[PDB]
Amino acid sequence: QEVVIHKIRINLTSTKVKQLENVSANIIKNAETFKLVKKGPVRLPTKVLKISTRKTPNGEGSKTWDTYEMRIHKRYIDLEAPAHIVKRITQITIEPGVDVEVIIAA
Amino acid sequence: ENVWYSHPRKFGKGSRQCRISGSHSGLIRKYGLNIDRQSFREKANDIGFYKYR
Amino acid sequence: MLIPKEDRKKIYQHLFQEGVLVAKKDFNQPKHEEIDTKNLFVIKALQSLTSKGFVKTQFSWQYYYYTLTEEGVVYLREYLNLPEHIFPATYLAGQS
Amino acid sequence: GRVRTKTVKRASKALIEKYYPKLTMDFQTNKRLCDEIATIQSKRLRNKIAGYTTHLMKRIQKGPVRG
Amino acid sequence: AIISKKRKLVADGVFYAELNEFFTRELAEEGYSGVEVRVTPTKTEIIIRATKVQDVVGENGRRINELTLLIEKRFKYKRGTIALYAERVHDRGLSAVAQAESMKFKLLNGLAIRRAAYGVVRYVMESGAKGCEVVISGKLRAARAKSMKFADGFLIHSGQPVNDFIETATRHVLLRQGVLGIKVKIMKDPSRNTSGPKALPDAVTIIEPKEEEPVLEPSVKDY
RNA sequence: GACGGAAGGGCACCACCAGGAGUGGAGCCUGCGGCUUAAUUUGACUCAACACGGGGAAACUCACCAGGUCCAGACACAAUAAGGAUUGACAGAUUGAGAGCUCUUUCUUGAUUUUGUGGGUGGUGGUGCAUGGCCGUUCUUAGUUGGUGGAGUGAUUUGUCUGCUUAAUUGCGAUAACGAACGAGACCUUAACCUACUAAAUAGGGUUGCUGGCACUUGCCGGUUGACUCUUCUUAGAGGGACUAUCGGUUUCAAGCCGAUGGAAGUUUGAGGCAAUAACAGGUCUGUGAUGCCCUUAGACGUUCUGGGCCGCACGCGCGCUACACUGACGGAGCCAGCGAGUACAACCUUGGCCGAGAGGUCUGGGUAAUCUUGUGAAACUCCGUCGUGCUGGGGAUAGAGCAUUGUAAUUAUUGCUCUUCAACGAGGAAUUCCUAGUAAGCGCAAGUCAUCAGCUUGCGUUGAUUACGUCCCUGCCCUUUGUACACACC
Ligand SMILES: [Mg+2]
Ligand SMILES: [Mg+2]
Ligand SMILES: [Mg+2]
Ligand SMILES: [Mg+2]
Ligand SMILES: [Mg+2]
Ligand SMILES: [Mg+2]
Ligand SMILES: [Mg+2]
Ligand SMILES: [Mg+2]
Ligand SMILES: [Mg+2]
Ligand SMILES: [Mg+2]
Ligand SMILES: [Mg+2]
Ligand SMILES: [Mg+2]
Ligand SMILES: [Mg+2]
Ligand SMILES: [Mg+2]
Ligand SMILES: [Mg+2]
Ligand SMILES: [Mg+2]
Ligand SMILES: [Mg+2]
């Protein structure tokens, strides 16, 4: 009918850690409910985006600096399923701030 | 509408022009921000950059 | 100010189609997005419109935002020569 | 360097006053008790408080103490 | 399509900032407070919080529609991939930005500055905040300029609980002799937090023990 | 209060001892004078101006100068109102000039406009002594405040202190104050531990297939995402863990400090982020469609092109780099990092193959990235060799010539490489900076600017000491007691 098992990679990216974790948990729950071939929520090394600015606008004063850093959390999950099921899983369980991304197919 | 009104401005401090001010001075072009420094500092939390350490 | 009339007409048409015009602060720019004119021609036209009511202008980050008042709409109708029961976004572009 | 603040010492004293029975001697148990009873926000602060309590207890088993 | 992930994230942030700026510029009379962006499947969801919702709405798709159109023109989306939703800012007093805006408005109108500040403080207090601090910097009578400081209640200043509980606002007010600057702080109640820590980190409160009459010699309850 | 060429008590490697590493000397980069200049644009002058304005300027930038171009002169009211308002203009002289800049011209253009008067708008013009915001500094020092109560007729004061403690108004204490708040602390980020969880062909292993080389017995080193499984190293979620714990001294037997012991961790566990009250005529109107007022506003201080200038040198000083060698130099060879960064509308990072002594070309790729650059096989280093202490093979400045590269443009060498040239300096006077542990110092690498340029900068690792673990002698700050005719406060 439709059920032919593919190779599905799902990417998750955010700045908020807790939200991301929640999303991951939700995904895992969904997987459990659908009980499919599963590879765990693989965590990629968090990416710290750095900026260095002189605190002054004008330049006069003791030369003081800023370290404005933005940390990126990137995590991926691997599933073997029909694509429709994956879509269904991912159409719900969306939280604002977390980017849900699907590779789909081998 | 003049015969010319432009000199080659593809690179250098002539090409890069800020999002907010339009300053050619102190421009942060890292990660493709193109925001001049002071302005960036003022609105850093809005971008998502924070001062942790 | 020294605007070819065809261009002006086009601009007017565009405005009526929309009710909204967003234009970069770019004099010495060859082409505008959507309209087949120079940016400068657009911007100055909009400024002119503003100067005697008609158009409302906002600036935010080197990028003019132009909207229309009812007087402006009336003026457009007079000039472009569109009848009644027509586009804009002021008296509902659709339903959102 | 290590001198405890008001917010440690006072709290510890209060704890002692409330719970001298069941707040006894060794550190880990004391810490656990603190965790149970007191609504301490940080972990480190809680730990510090527990340590102080333990110290107080130790001092006690050699005579009475002021306050 | 085909842009670096970190870069993309940065761009998103930038876009958000731009949007915020735009809202500040436009919806000042309506009293704009905050924007939320949700990039869901198909459509981008922009949630607006303003003091005058009705005004924002317009003739049910007069002003909002225009705004949407403008947005489309700017960031380049399809006609139907951007939605706008005006909302009530729940407790106007607990929002610093709103307060600042109000102050600015008052100044524009021509109210006595000190009095206005006092009123603002009172409002804040009513709203149920732990503390308010209003700094009004500039030339307030005579050329030689001075920052006046109107405060009430708690306030913290140092540490990470600052970005947790203290909400800040800075708005510069334009008058025909020079610029004023209005800086407003609000210390929100730690217990009334919703998301995050429910107290100041230093505050340690112990629970009370229960009453005891224990001994009275053994005995056994049996079943 | 402020100050004192008054007396006491603190604190600090922006103080000093005990030492280290030095700068100041030298050649050079580069700031700032001064001079010079058509211009060599300016801002800032003790700490808190001086490799600072993210200020590494070939134009752009650009604010300066020699020149040209344009209207981006809103709108309001009027004179022409098409027999034209007015736009456009190749050829050469015109002009730096395929600038109709115009003057030769006589073909177009169609009421947009132009000529004036109201009125503006733009200004890296002016004033930071009219302001905002931000920042810097008093001060990251330990300081600051109100509610009662006490003392004063009162301004005020006590709390906020004789001591001892601490990094700390941190505490223990003493007590007309008692209990509090801000600051300190707590916090948060990070760096340390986790054979305990939860995991992985975008991390690493194990066995085992096939397979390459070995000794040749089973055994040793390999190549392959062929299988199966694992999570110690890896990443990162949730936790835990240290609280000066245990003991010993010492101290009103206090707060604490000192010494063992265990431990990943015993300097606030290491480093930061944040940081009060009150202020300064500190710095920015050269970050702003932040901005008052003033100037200016079509021979514009708006602009826009074109060339130059910011970089000029009798000379002062300010960060730095390179060095004055034998703990080296030069050749081999050995050969180990951590932070990073990286393009589809562009031209990012760029392995691998060929061409070239280089620099570089070239073809192909892989990568929007724990996947490819990249194990960034980085320097300092270690191993064996050539010279052995002579301005010597130390050292590298000026130079001369060529070959490359970026860009529209390299003289006033942009820079990269090749040969040659071989200058000053045998460790630096008067001075004076920085520093107490994975620190000082050595050494690279990295992003920042960047089309191109690193002697600069934020980070990062790599190698890794010497010496205090203290004191007010100097210096600055703070407090107490005093004096004051000062309170715009000793200028
Ligand atoms: Mg605090
Ligand atoms: Mg703190
Ligand atoms: Mg100082
Ligand atoms: Mg210069
Ligand atoms: Mg540089
Ligand atoms: Mg400007
Ligand atoms: Mg000032
Ligand atoms: Mg009283
Ligand atoms: Mg006092
Ligand atoms: Mg003991
Ligand atoms: Mg600390
Ligand atoms: Mg001044
Ligand atoms: Mg100005
Ligand atoms: Mg410096
Ligand atoms: Mg790598
Ligand atoms: Mg020689
Ligand atoms: Mg250069």
Automatic annotation (TrEMBL), chain A:
Residue stretches in coiled coil: none
InterPro entries: Ribosomal_uS10, Ribosomal_uS10_dom, Ribosomal_uS10_dom_sf, Ribosomal_uS10_euk/arc
UniProt entry keywords in alphabetical sequence: Ribonucleoprotein, Ribosomal protein
Domain Small ribosomal subunit protein uS10: 9-103
GO biological process, one term: translation
Family recorded in the similarity comment: Belongs to the universal ribosomal protein uS10 family.
UniProt name for this protein: Small ribosomal subunit protein uS10
TrEMBL record, chain C:
Annotated GO CC locations: cytosolic small ribosomal subunit
Subcellular location: Cytoplasm
Signal peptide range in chain numbering: none
Keyword field contains Amino-acid biosynthesis: no
Family annotation (Pfam families): S10_plectin (PF03501)
GO terms of biological process kind: cellular response to amino acid starvation; ribosomal subunit export from nucleus
GO molecular function terms attached to this record: RNA binding; structural constituent of ribosome
Keyword Ion transport set for record: no
Residue ranges of domain Plectin/eS10 N-terminal in the record: 3-92
Keywords: Cytoplasm, Ribonucleoprotein, Ribosomal protein
The protein's role, per its UniProt record: Component of the ribosome, a large ribonucleoprotein complex responsible for the synthesis of proteins in the cell. The small ribosomal subunit (SSU) binds messenger RNAs (mRNAs) and translates the encoded message by selecting cognate aminoacyl-transfer RNA (tRNA) molecules. The large subunit (LSU) contains the ribosomal catalytic site termed the peptidyl transferase center (PTC), which catalyzes the formation of peptide bonds, thereby polymerizing the amino acids delivered by tRNAs into a polypeptide chain.
Protein family per UniProt: Belongs to the eukaryotic ribosomal protein eS10 family.
Name of the protein in question: KLLA0B08173p
Automatic annotation (TrEMBL), chain D:
Similarity comment: Belongs to the eukaryotic ribosomal protein eS17 family.
Name by which UniProt lists this protein: KLLA0B01474p
Native species: Kluyveromyces lactis (strain ATCC 8585 / CBS 2359 / DSM 70799 / NBRC 1267 / NRRL Y-1140 / WM37)
Automatic annotation (TrEMBL), chain E:
Record's keyword terms, sorted: Ribonucleoprotein, Ribosomal protein, RNA-binding
Keyword Ribosomal protein tagged: yes
Keyword Ribonucleoprotein: yes
Molecular function in Gene Ontology: RNA binding; structural constituent of ribosome
Gene3D superfamilies documented for this protein: 3.30.300.20, Ribosomal protein S3, C-terminal domain
The protein's name: Small ribosomal subunit protein uS3
Annotated KH type-2 domain residues: 19-90
Annotated source species: Kluyveromyces lactis (strain ATCC 8585 / CBS 2359 / DSM 70799 / NBRC 1267 / NRRL Y-1140 / WM37)
An example Gene Ontology CC term for this record: nucleus
Annotated family: Belongs to the universal ribosomal protein uS3 family.
Biased composition (Basic and acidic residues): 211-223
InterPro entries (alphabetical): KH_dom-like_a/b, KH_dom_type_2, KH_sf_prok-type, Ribosomal_S3_C_sf, Ribosomal_uS3, Ribosomal_uS3_C, Ribosomal_uS3_CS, Ribosomal_uS3_euk/arc
SUPFAM superfamilies: Prokaryotic type KH domain (KH-domain type II) (SSF54814), Ribosomal protein S3 C-terminal domain (SSF54821)
Domain of life of the native organism: Eukaryota
One GO term (biological process): translation
